[PDB]
Design a protein around this ligand. Structure first.
Ligand SMILES: Cc1ccn(Cc2[nH]nc3ncccc23)c(=O)c1Oc1cc(Cl)cc(C#N)c1
Lengths: 553, 403
């Protein structure tokens, strides 16, 4: 069957003509196979013989016991118009409502069951060459959607939408998931009314040239779909088997990470940082990577999580979603989403680096944004958060931060480690604390530099650095003052870069110099940081400037 | 009615902008709205042979949900048509009025059909939850609300609708920007409010069925210099920096005398007595700061930029310029309001001012996370236009130089 549905008017790209690619002479055995295939397809209505007036051509090939016909639509695909991007997103099991009865209906010979715009059929022209290419070939063109063609997935999906429309309008309490050439039908009806409504569906589809399986051929739960297991009251990922091996290659770690990442959507606490760190360094697939202590420990913890099986529950739209986040370690975050306490719909992890210098408060808000988005996709609504951060910590941070920051509806949950700011900077200068005027300077040619300070109480220092930048020297100068100062410090810099980093209360950095600075800032009782313009003869700034410029600039 | 042909700029073609995920409530609101517009023939369902897409959202302002189509990309791609080919002259008088009322006039557009060969470029998708179904796709058969080409085409009809009112009230400035009418007068508030009611009746007879600004009362937010008795080392360091910066933008700023007070490696807390020469230069700098920037003028061929800084405790500062420090306008915004709600309100206030003053929306430099702003902006948005925006990191010192 070939659907009696209206056709989709396909066009070629503006200012382009159809493909005119020569057929390559094939073997007698290949020509014979193509002839058998093509005559069968022609009797079925799938293809039609054409006259020699049609100038277009796409190459054909036969591959092997049966023979398959392979049409190379590369040229036509480059000339066919762009189509609407099919469906941007795939159903997540956790977004599925638990239905009384569900049936899976795969459409049989999908593309071949839908017609092709008559005016575009000319461009699908192909030729079965004659023996040693002496005689003119047998020419055909497609009447249905050809496999490998650009418009097929779009045009099929669109035809399937048009067909289902009337059934959807009259059966609103029946869910139909449209995925590729499958239909997933769920209802909250007793076996019998559903087995009937499905037959009505199967029948409505037949009136439109679309054939689906009958009761004996229809799949029975549990459905093994897209790496998932869909059971009548739970869902999970399919079996994850972590390979045991003496020597791990780049490809082995790559596959391991993928499996763990996949497992992370239901199994809580999955960690991949130490495994990922091994992968950086341009090594070959076959190249063996020795595990670090930490990678071994991460793998061990994961094997433990995976030992016993875990499942997820389906969605109840009458209930709110609760999302709980936990700090797992450095840069690592883990979350769980549920409606009823500890019966998770799904889980996940967040372990990103937004910038070079950050803190847990920023990281927590980033994870809340990622979870929020994900909730809108899966459920069409935001969850309520349970965060390991105190409301006082949050309001102190938000209030004083330069960026507009916002976490929707939340509640603190005492689940350690808790999110805190490790240090705070003074708002006004400190009385009875030494005033360090810090500076840094690096010669751009030699790449050498000097870092130092001049204090208000007569002190001075200057260190030489070898493979530096002005940014590195100015950060060294701050570190110098933090090292040689008391427990109360007023620091004046002409570096907005350094000022910027420090004012943001980082607790973690990609830079070791910044982590050394952080260690000092935490140790301190009171620190006040001020900025002045450079090169203007300002106070103690002019004095460090001359000190660090000696030999440098 | 005969359609005006829309000739898209050569080379580049239609928008292919992704639809952002929408909540269940917003989706439902849009499906009900679109079903209606489809029955009324305003829009029609489309095939996959339409590769184009522009985002669609649902806002309020009202308890009623309204559809908002983001035509930012289409507008950039049709700039020749709505700005050069067709083009609404902006009246210089509007910013001088004691009162400006803003009227939603977007309902007019649906009575004018769109060129049959341009409709494909107006394609949009209503998305579904958990990708149950492919999205509902539509295109417009009428002038769409939010497209800059719509008031451009509707100009002639708008002129006729307004002719009697304008003839009877020669001192009323009426400006059309996108879906809105900006109506300004120098009348007493009661008389102004009376004339707008009169204009609504004229609008009502053609079909088309407020928001009150006071532009004559729009003043600058000058760079404020502290007025104090006892000046600390930090205080003057803070001054010289604030003044050193203003000297890049404002012509005639002097600092030599103030700078001269900072000699040697002194403690920040050390109170240093001021000179009656340094006191004179801050007085002269104050005087320059309260006045407009000398030599900064609006260039119509250049884009407008708006920069916003979070000042804490519900206060926000902003600046509008075309050249990075050559700034045309500087102001402030003040507020159970949260940071996104506050920033949303500020971007809209700055935008209405830009429309009134220049007839152009600025390109915003927002001190927020893209994703936060992307998920949240629609919760508080109430304008029928959307300006362009970039996501930035407020340089630490810019904030303190503006209060
Ligand atoms: C339409 C539907 C609704 C609920 N559940 C969740 C559920 N509720 N009740 C069930 N009874 C048995 C098994 C699952 C059940 C489903 O699985 C379902 O069918 C699908 C959806 C997807 Cl994404 C892939 C496949 C596939 N393949 C099947």
């Amino acid at each position: 069957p070939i659907s009696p549905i209206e056709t989709v008017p396909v066009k070629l790209k503006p200012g382009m003509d159809g493909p005119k690619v020569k057929q390559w002479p094939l073997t007698e055995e290949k020509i014979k196979a193509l002839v058998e295939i093509c005559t069968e397809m022609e009797k079925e209505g799938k293809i039609s013989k054409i006259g020699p007036e049609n100038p277009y051509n796409t190459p054909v090939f036969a591959i092997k016991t049966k023979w398959r016909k392979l049409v190379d639509f590369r040229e036509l695909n480059k000339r066919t118009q762009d189509f609407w991007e099919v469906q941007l997103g795939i159903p997540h099991p956790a977004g599925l409502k638990k239905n009384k009865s569900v049936t899976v209906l795969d459409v049989g010979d999908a593309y071949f069951s839908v017609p092709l715009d008559e005016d575009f059929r000319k461009y699908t022209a192909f030729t079965i060459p004659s023996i040693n290419n002496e005689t003119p070939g047998i020419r055909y063109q497609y009447n249905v959607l050809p496999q490998g063609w650009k418009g097929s997935p779009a045009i099929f999906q669109s035809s399937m939408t048009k067909i289902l429309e009337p059934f959807r309008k009259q059966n609103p309490d029946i869910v139909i998931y449209q995925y590729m050439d499958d239909l997933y039908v769920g209802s909250d009806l007793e076996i019998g009314q559903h087995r009937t409504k499905i037959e009505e569906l199967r029948q409505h589809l037949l009136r439109w040239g679309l054939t689906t399986p009958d009761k004996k051929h229809q799949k029975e739960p549990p459905f093994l779909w897209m790496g998932y297991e869909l059971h009548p009251d739970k869902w999970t990922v399919q079996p994850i088997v972590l390979p045991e091996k003496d020597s791990w290659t780049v490809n082995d770690i790559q596959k391991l990470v993928g499996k763990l990442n996949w497992a992370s959507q239901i199994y809580p606490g999955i960690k991949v940082r130490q495994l990922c760190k091994l992968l950086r360094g341009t090594k070959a697939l076959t190249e063996v990577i020795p595990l670090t202590e930490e990678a071994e420990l991460e793998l061990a913890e994961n094997r433990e999580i995976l030992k016993e099986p875990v499942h997820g529950v389906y969605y109840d739209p009458s209930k709110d979603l609760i999302a709980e986040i936990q700090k797992q370690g450095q840069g690592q975050w883990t979350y769980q989403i549920y409606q009823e306490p500890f019966k998770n719909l799904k889980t996940g992890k967040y372990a990103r680096m937004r910038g070079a210098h950050t803190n847990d408060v920023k990281q927590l808000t980033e994870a809340v944004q990622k979870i929020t988005t994900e909730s809108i996709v899966i459920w069409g609504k935001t969850p309520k958060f349970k965060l390991p951060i105190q409301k006082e910590t949050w309001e102190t941070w938000w209030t004083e931060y330069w960026q507009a920051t916002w976490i929707p509806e939340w509640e603190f949950v005492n689940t350690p480690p808790l999110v805190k700011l490790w240090y705070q900077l003074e708002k006004e200068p400190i009385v009875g604390a030494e005033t360090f005027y810090v500076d840094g300077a690096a010669n751009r040619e030699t790449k050498l530099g000097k870092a130092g300070y001049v204090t208000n109480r007569g002190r001075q220092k200057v260190v030489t650095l070898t493979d530096t930048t002005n940014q590195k020297t100015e950060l060294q100068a701050i570190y110098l003052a933090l090292q040689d100062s008391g427990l109360e410090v007023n620091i004046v810099t002409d570096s907005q870069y350094a000022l910027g980093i420090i004012q943001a209360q980082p607790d973690q950095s990609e830079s070791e110099l910044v982590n050394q600075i952080i260690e000092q800032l935490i140790k301190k009782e009171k620190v006040y940081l001020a900025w002045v313009p450079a090169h203007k003869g300002i106070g103690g700034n002019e004095q460090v400037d001359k000190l660090v410029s000696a030999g440098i600039r | 009615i005969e359609t005006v042909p829309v000739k898209l700029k050569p080379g580049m073609d239609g928008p292919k902008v992704k639809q952002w995920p929408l909540t269940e409530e917003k989706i439902k609101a849009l499906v009900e709205i679109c079903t209606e517009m489809e029955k009324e023939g305003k829009i029609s369902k489309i095939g996959p042979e339409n590769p184009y897409n522009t985002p669609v959202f649902a806002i309020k302002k009202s308890t009623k949900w309204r559809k908002l189509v983001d035509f930012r990309e289409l507008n950039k791609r049709t700039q020749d048509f709505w700005e050069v080919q067709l083009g609404i002259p902006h009246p210089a008088g509007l910013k001088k009025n004691k009162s400006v009322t803003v009227l939603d006039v977007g309902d007019a557009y649906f009575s004018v059909p769109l060129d049959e060969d341009f409709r494909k470029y107006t394609a949009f998708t209503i998305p579904s939850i958990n990708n149950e179904t492919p999205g509902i796709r539509y295109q417009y058969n009428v002038l769409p609300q939010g497209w800059k080409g719509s008031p451009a085409i509707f100009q002639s009809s708008m002129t006729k609708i307004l002719e009697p009112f304008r003839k009877q009230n020669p001192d009323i400035v009426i400006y059309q920007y996108m879906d809105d009418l900006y109506v300004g007068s120098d009348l007493e508030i009661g008389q102004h409010r009376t004339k707008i009611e009169e204009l609504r009746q004229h609008l009502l007879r053609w079909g088309l069925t407020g928001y009150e600004l006071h532009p004559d009362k729009w003043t600058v937010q000058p760079i404020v210099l502290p007025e104090k008795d006892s000046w600390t080392v930090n205080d003057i360091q803070k001054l010289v920096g604030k003044l050193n910066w203003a000297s890049q933008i404002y012509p005639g700023i002097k600092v030599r005398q103030l700078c001269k007070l900072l000699r040697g490696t002194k403690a920040l807390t050390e109170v240093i007595p001021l000179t009656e020469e340094a006191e004179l230069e801050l007085a002269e700098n104050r005087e320059i700061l309260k006045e407009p920037v000398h030599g900064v003028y609006y260039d119509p061929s250049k884009d407008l930029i708006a920069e916003i800084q979070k000042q804490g405790q519900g206060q926000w500062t902003y600046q509008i310029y075309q050249e990075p420090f050559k700034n045309l306008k500087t102001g402030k915004y003040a507020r159970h309001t949260n940071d996104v709600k506050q920033l949303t309100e500020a971007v809209q206030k700055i935008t209405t001012e830009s429309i009134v003053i220049w007839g152009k929306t600025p390109k915003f430099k927002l001190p927020i996370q893209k994703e936060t702003w992307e998920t949240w902006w629609t919760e508080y948005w109430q304008a029928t236009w959307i300006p362009e925006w970039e996501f930035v990191n407020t340089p630490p010192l810019v904030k303190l130089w503006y209060q």
